């Protein structure tokens, strides 16, 4: 009896979206949306249709429409997904100077990043991967171990966050971190 358009939405935090509630009854008693998000009704001549401008959506939200058709109050809900690039991507504090043969451990911190379902992180040496895992927890902790060989004396080491919105229709966004060049001696 009640419909909603659109249905699944993915928008950046701080933006706006326009959702519409409509009913089959053409004189329903009441009609509106129930969400804690700041709305601003836009006045249109539709008596079975109302539109709302939801501003500054910062997190995931699932609002629902209610319209009062004489056949019984009907409900229909939408699903909003928020996305943003992670705030802080950083490697563990380590000294530049390393002697040959030592076992080296490298951690990469990933603060934030949403949605974490489509967000993965990669630990790189120049442009070669070593481990590739999704981001879990905040800050997302990922580690790998490398044995110090002196043929990579001065080689750059960095990690990179990688969120793809390709299946939902958008682009993939990525972030490189600070490069750490190890200085092998001995």
């Amino acid at each position: 009896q009640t419909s909603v358009s659109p249905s699944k939405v993915i928008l950046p935090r701080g933006g706006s979206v326009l959702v519409t509630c409509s009913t089959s009854c053409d004189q329903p008693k009441l009609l509106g949306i129930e969400t804690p998000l700041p709305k601003k009704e836009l006045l249109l001549p539709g008596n079975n249709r109302k539109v709302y401008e939801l501003s500054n959506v910062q997190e995931d939200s699932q609002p629902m429409c209610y319209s009062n058709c004489p056949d019984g109050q009907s409900t229909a809900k939408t699903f909003l997904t928020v996305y943003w690039t992670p705030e802080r991507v950083e490697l563990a504090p380590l000294p530049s100077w390393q002697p040959v043969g030592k076992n080296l451990t490298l951690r990469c911190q990933v603060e934030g990043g949403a949605p974490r379902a489509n967000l993965t992180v990669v630990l790189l040496r120049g442009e070669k991967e070593l481990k590739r895992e999704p981001a879990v927890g905040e800050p997302a902790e990922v580690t790998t171990t490398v044995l110090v060989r002196r043929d990579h004396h001065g080689a750059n080491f960095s990690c990179r966050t990688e969120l793809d919105l390709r299946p939902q229709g958008l682009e993939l966004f990525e972030n490189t971190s600070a490069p750490y060049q190890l200085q092998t001696f001995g």
Partner: protein, 428 residues
């Protein structure tokens, strides 16, 4: 509004949509996707075929899994002769009644000559490694066969004389051009109609491009992870159409050549390739709904006045002429409120998207009952800044409402004594 006169910009926007389609296709594998039907194999036949001039194509030039029949592309299409019957009723799509479709499929779209692509044998296309050229063969086949069908059925479902009127020749050229544009949205996964045939047809397409991405990989491929896009192989299918669109249109010119009109909307019969494929599909069906509606109102209005000519030029208030005019004024109203019910969902869906582009900011993507939100609001957003109307509260741009769009770019001339889609003798 429907003051000053506003410019016509439908061709200007699809032109920018054409520029963007080329530039991002040349970034990827545009050149390695150019095809000609003469370079494919059909029926697992390696014998020389004469497909240099594509007009020489026949139904045997097809990878149809059946092809025991005589009808190749138009098999099982319009068995009731209602494709161009003037004033025929439009239908709704099928999917789960979630976000109900305001998509109203045109009659020529429902009876589209595509039986070859629906029963396509994916083996005979990719068994050789020339799937690109073996694909354009079946696309140009349905394109040339449907152009022959549309020009033929329109002249029969409306009984046109040998000196065809220029308004009907323009009505056919647009109908053919609307068919060329719908085909492009089929290849790219932009098609709105979700039928049992289309899903199986799209199932063959996904399999075919899955071999095509691996075909031109002969290493690094510009379509990394294109299988995980919606629609699947989004970028690859979009690029493939841009490469061969001038040839799919050259295939139809083999059938448009016998229409003696070369100006107006038949300007593309001989010269050039049209830009209708880069105008969103929901809009091309809105103008076509407006055309068949104005063709339907002119019929019901002339039938009405033949029965009620008495009652306003002398009919008494209870005679046969009043009951004859009573049913005529109720039948005429029964038809219009039928169609305006479709127009209501159309005008309201158009309004939802135009204003959606003013508040939604960069990076906003939608997915729901229909796939085409993301492409629709992007068209308006680029349109709203070309006209300069992005402040929520402006009405100067006539494209603010659905009727205002048909005022600028639509071609509805035949509506009688009522040219109004905008507002802001029967009782004897």
């Amino acid at each position: 509004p429907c003051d000053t006169i506003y410019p016509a910009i439908a061709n200007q926007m699809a032109h920018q949509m054409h520029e963007d389609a080329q530039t991002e296709a040349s970034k990827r594998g545009l050149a390695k996707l150019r095809a000609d039907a003469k370079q494919g194999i059909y029926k697992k036949n390696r014998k020389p075929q004469e497909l240099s001039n594509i007009c020489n194509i026949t139904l045997q030039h097809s990878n149809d899994s059946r092809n025991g029949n005589n009808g190749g592309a138009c098999t099982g299409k319009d068995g009731n002769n209602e494709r161009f019957k003037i004033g025929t009723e439009w239908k709704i799509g099928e999917k789960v009644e979630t976000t109900d479709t305001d998509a109203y499929i045109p009659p020529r779209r429902q009876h589209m000559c595509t039986s070859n692509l629906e029963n396509l044998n994916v083996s005979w296309v990719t068994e050789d490694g020339k799937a690109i050229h073996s694909l354009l063969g079946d696309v140009q086949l349905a394109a040339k066969m449907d152009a022959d069908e549309i020009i033929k059925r329109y002249k029969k479902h409306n009984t046109l004389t040998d000196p065809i009127q220029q308004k009907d020749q323009e009505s056919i050229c647009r109908a053919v051009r609307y068919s060329f544009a719908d085909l492009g949205d089929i290849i790219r996964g932009r098609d709105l109609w979700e039928h049992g045939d289309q899903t199986k047809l799209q199932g063959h397409l996904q399999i075919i491009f899955g071999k095509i991405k691996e075909e031109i990989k002969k290493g690094n491929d510009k379509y990394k992870g294109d299988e995980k896009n919606n629609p699947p192989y989004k970028q690859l299918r979009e690029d493939w159409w841009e490469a061969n669109r001038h040839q799919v249109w050259r295939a139809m010119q083999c059938e448009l050549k016998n229409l003696k009109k070369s100006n107006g909307d038949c300007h593309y019969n001989s010269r050039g390739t049209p830009l209708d494929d880069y105008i969103p599909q929901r809009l091309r069906w809105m103008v076509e709904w407006a055309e068949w509606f104005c063709k339907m109102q002119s019929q019901e209005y002339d039938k009405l006045m033949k029965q009620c000519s008495q009652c306003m030029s002398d009919c008494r208030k209870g005679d046969v002429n009043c009951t004859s005019c009573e049913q005529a004024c109720e039948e005429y109203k029964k038809k219009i409120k039928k169609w305006e019910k479709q127009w209501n969902k159309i005008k309201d869906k158009y309004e939802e998207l135009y204003l959606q582009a003013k508040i939604a900011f960069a990076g906003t993507s939608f997915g729901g009952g229909d796939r085409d939100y993301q492409q629709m609001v992007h068209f308006f957003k680029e349109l709203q800044k070309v006209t300069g109307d992005t402040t929520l509260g402006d009405t100067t741009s006539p494209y603010s409402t659905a009727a205002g769009y048909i005022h600028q770019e639509g071609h509805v001339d035949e509506c009688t004594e009522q040219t109004q889609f905008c507002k802001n003798a029967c009782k004897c």
